[PDB]
Write a protein that binds this ligand. Structure first.
Ligand code: CZ3
Ligand code: ZN
Length: 97
C-alpha cells in the first residue's frame, strides 16, 4: 500500500537526538550526527539512524556524518529525503579511485 516509516519514531525529532549527545566525548560533531538522523546508543561512539536504524562506530575525528550515511546506508529514505539521490550517487562515485 504505502511503506517505510521509522522503527523508533521517538527519535524523529532533532531535539530528541541531540538529547543523547549531552555526554558526547568525541570530536565527531554531535550536531551533524543528530542532524543526520543519528543518536548515541550509550556505548562508545555507537550511533544509529532513527529512520533506517543504520548503526555506525569507529568515527574519525573529522568525518562528515552525511558522507558516512550515504556510503554505509544508501537506501535510507531519510537520507534520500534530506540529501537527494544525486548526493548519494555522487558520494559513491567519488569513492571509486
Ligand atoms: C570510518 N567511519 C565509521 C563511521 C565506519 O565506517 N565504521 C564502520 C561501521 O561502523 N560499519 C561498517 C558498516 C556497518 C557498520 C557497523 N555496524 N553495523 N551495524 N551496526 C554497526 S556498529 C553498531 C553496533 C551496535 C549499535 C550501534 C552501532 C566500521 C569500521 O566499524 C566496525 C564495526 C562493526 C560491526 C559489525 C557487523 O559485521 C557484519 C554483519 C559481518 N558479519 C556477518 O555475520 C556477515 C553478515 N557474514 C558475511 C562481518 O563482520 N563480516 C562479513 C565478512 C567478514 C566480516 C568483515 N570484516 N572483515 N574484517 N573485519 C570485518 S568487520 C567489518 C565490517 C564492516 C566493514 C569492514 C569490516
Ligand atoms: Zn538512515
Amino acid at each position: 500500500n504505502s511503506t517505510n516509516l521509522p522503527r523508533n519514531p521517538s527519535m524523529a525529532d532533532y531535539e530528541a537526538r541531540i538529547f543523547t549527545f549531552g555526554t558526547w566525548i568525541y570530536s565527531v560533531n554531535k550536531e551533524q550526527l543528530a542532524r543526520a538522523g543519528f543518536y548515541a546508543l550509550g556505548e562508545g561512539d555507537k550511533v544509529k539512524c532513527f529512520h533506517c536504524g543504520g548503526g555506525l562506530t569507529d568515527w574519525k575525528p573529522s568525518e562528515d556524518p552525511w558522507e558516512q550515511h550515504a556510503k554505509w546506508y544508501p537506501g535510507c529514505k531519510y537520507l534520500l529525503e534530506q540529501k537527494g539521490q544525486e548526493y548519494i550517487n555522487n558520494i559513491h562515485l567519488t569513492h571509486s579511485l
